[PDB]
Design a protein around this ligand. Structure first.
Ligand SMILES: NC(=O)NCCC[C@H](N)C(=O)O
Ligand SMILES: NC(=O)NCCC[C@H](N)C(=O)O
Ligand SMILES: NC(=O)NCCC[C@H](N)C(=O)O
Ligand SMILES: [Cl-]
Ligand SMILES: [Cl-]
Ligand SMILES: [Cl-]
Lengths: 340, 338, 334
């Protein structure tokens, strides 16, 4: 009866540039595929659907998780990869993205890009002629949110995404906030964006998400009031208050505004939910064991920044499950779009 | 015949085109074409299976580096990329030593960098095949790609029947190599640019002696209209190459500017089927930081080529770039394959 | 034996028995033979390995890559820039993330404490590819090389001297290895650069049980007499100050390995070793600047000794790969 390849047909050869380009059913399919690939890998029965494929991984910003997740997922699936890091390439200074896309599209079967304006990854996606995957831009981080939604499903009992309530605290207009809001809207979830109003997401993006959420039964709340924002949440999520590519000056501008939105044990208690779970895309500043994190926190008399060591290392934290799921979801994206 | 050539190429380095016969070069081009077809037909045999290859890059690269990686992967090899930082090379360890160490662990080595003398020392000391992926003096894999492309875009002409011009900095690596390749294959090449940037007189003298025996012709001129009349292909490259000081732009642009490839130049060929080539990367508009800043300083739109030419139907630059991979593959398979 | 090495980290030689070390060396010799005979069996097929380098490397990095590739594994090289490590993400966090995606992890970097943290938190085998304190893969390669270049001597029958900066990672590790394997080692250099007293004491206790001997001396003639091998390394290591050349050259100069030193062994078959990279002439930017400044031609070793029939440095370098292969196959192979 229901066994169908139509949906798989439609994903073939698509780019993965942002979640606004995908239907609710497409996103769910990607999540369900991710789950199946994760099980097959743990059961030792994984089938290689990217055998003989060559993939280019362009990184104009630093990465640990995203880069490793692309490499491992390709290797498990039978593909090879060429990593092109932030120096040593011609890209940007000597060669246009239009030119780079057409050259790489002649040699590789798929291309990942992490960098700056969403406009750049969109040009790559238009000119390459092979599938292009967004591994983070200034505006959106779509692979992260797939991982996050898989993680929420796994750490819930008998709930679909549409039944889940969560809050994101801090810099709500960074890539991860934007993307969470879009995904929540697509999947019918209840999202609260909790932070200072100057860092709320763009009004046009919010308006587009609200129109989406009207059709899916989702809810989107923006607030500066933590107690109101987190009450009843299944998950609390945060990220660094200053993102890659922004000025180091921005710490001075932001810490005093962002400080009330730190995820500490008080915040978890304000949920009223003893089963609440803590998520963070990573990397995180939760103590003095990084150079940047230590310097900033020392300057403001803090121990951690966006999250405390106590929350980050608690039984409530599921950040490493979430990080592992980067790899399974990126795999699903590659298999769906390029798998054969 | 082609079996003779294949036998003679086994275990050789690929350091420059002066190290090869006319027939060896033709064989490499023919092998490139066979490997390209096999890849598109899905019938490619993996002749580098179980081989491990090191790729040393002392300068930046997109095309060359990817072409080496992809060709190796398709042929069943694995690769280690060693970029301009993070290795011991140059600052802590001599090239002689690096060569002897890598030659013990890898089955072949690519090098892109500075003096030709450095790739020659690597090629002498490694004890495994060493392939030049660009030096200050020569860029031999690029020219194989260019000759394959010319053949594909000509209708039943052999290389010996082709006439082409290279415009601009004629003494850079690509101009030197085009002149050598043209002489070896019996072609008619015009090098068109300011006389101070003509290739070295000893290199020209050697290429003229080669050309005498192949029926090739080599012309050096400052005059564009004269140099490009009747050409099948026009070719150019950036006017300041990697490793030269960025200061060079300041007094090189004005000097070079008459040698820009624009639509007037194409019209001066008298040839409605004329095709445009460029090794890439190219400065043809304001969508690069360097290209925009240098052009703005002179109020220009593109540098060595205009957007109008680069994106026209006469341009074959992306066919030429894809052919980098197929030709590098043939080099590796010929020298290291079994 | 093989069973007991499965799933272990390889962080330093002090964590292993004499017999475990010998087994690793013997496995290295078997894998080397299989590779040259074309009969090598892939025991890491489908495995994915991460290679974290916080310092530069040519040999070590290449040896890990090639050994993985030959064994059917794939690798991700994470160099000193382009990752989140150190400035934006703690080692504890990096370890737990990588251990979820990879089957094994190599680390080259700074304090031993950092590799021990990685080893504790990753949850998969971790291998030390050089720290400030120890360099355990190098010494396996060195001991394989000594065996191959000796005729039917066991390690316990070998005498050797290490000259120069005896307290660097390589000296420390040579001393530990020698004590474990019952060898006679002389550390020959200025007293200020002798190894830590606590480390020496632990190695002496080990050596009493194996029949090894450890001598520290500032006298070259006494230190090198009757040696089978002479070994040296750069006088200033990665991560140390460039100012240290000013402090050290005058003190280290008398311990340069030149032809006189080889002659003081009284052994016409003496062999010369060096972990590499080496400063033996003016063909490196650092080596040339330093040597020019002090009116020298080579530093820790002369061109004459380095390129002589006595030098086995490139054999030693090739054995980096075969020994790293053994470590990976023993700890992760199936
Ligand atoms: N897990 C990730 O992929 N994290 C990347 C850092 C995201 C952060 N908003 C940034 O753009 O720096
Ligand atoms: N296609 C290529 O491999 N191009 C590389 C650059 C050539 C240019 N003459 C240079 O040396 O900078
Ligand atoms: N062969 C090697 O792995 N050499 C690495 C350098 C060792 C040297 N003592 C250093 O720490 O700089
Ligand atoms: Cl998105
Ligand atoms: Cl050449
Ligand atoms: Cl050790």
């Amino acid at each position: 009866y229901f066994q169908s390849n139509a949906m798989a047909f439609n994903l073939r050869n698509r780019n993965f540039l942002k979640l606004l380009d995908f239907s609710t059913k497409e996103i769910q399919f990607l999540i369900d595929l991710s789950a199946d690939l994760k099980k097959a890998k743990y059961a030792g029965t994984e089938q290689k659907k990217l055998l003989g494929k060559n993939i280019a991984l362009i990184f104009e910003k630093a990465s640990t998780r995203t880069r490793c997740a692309f490499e491992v997922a390709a290797f498990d699936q039978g593909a090879q990869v060429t990593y092109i890091g932030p120096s040593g390439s011609q890209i940007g200074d000597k060669e246009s993205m239009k030119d780079t896309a057409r050259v790489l599209g002649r040699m590789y079967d798929g291309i990942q890009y992490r960098g700056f304006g969403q406009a750049i990854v969109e040009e790559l996606g238009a000119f390459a002629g092979v599938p292009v995957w967004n591994g983070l831009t200034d505006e959106f981080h779509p692979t992260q949110i797939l991982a996050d939604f898989l993680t929420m499903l796994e750490h819930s009992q008998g709930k679909a995404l549409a039944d889940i309530q969560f809050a994101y605290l801090g810099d709500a207009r960074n890539n991860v906030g934007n993307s969470l809001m879009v995904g929540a809207a697509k999947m019918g979830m209840d999202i609260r964006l909790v932070g200072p109003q100057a860092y709320w997401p763009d009004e046009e993006l919010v308006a587009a998400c609200q129109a989406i959420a009207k059709q899916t039964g989702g809810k989107i709340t923006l607030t500066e009031n933590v107690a109101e924002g987190v009450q009843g949440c299944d998950f609390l999520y945060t990220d660094v208050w200053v993102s890659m590519g922004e000025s180091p000056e921005a710490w001075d501008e932001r810490v005093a505004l962002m400080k009330p939105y730190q995820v500490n044990m008080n915040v978890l208690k304000q949920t009223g939910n003893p089963n609440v779970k803590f998520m963070h895309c990573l990397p995180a500043f939760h103590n003095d064991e990084t150079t940047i994190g230590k310097q900033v926190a020392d300057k403001f008399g803090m121990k951690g920044l966006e999250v405390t060591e106590e929350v980050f290392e608690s039984e409530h934290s599921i950040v490493f499950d979430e990080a592992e799921n980067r790899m399974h979801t990126i795999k699903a994206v590659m298999v769906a779009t390029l798998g054969s």
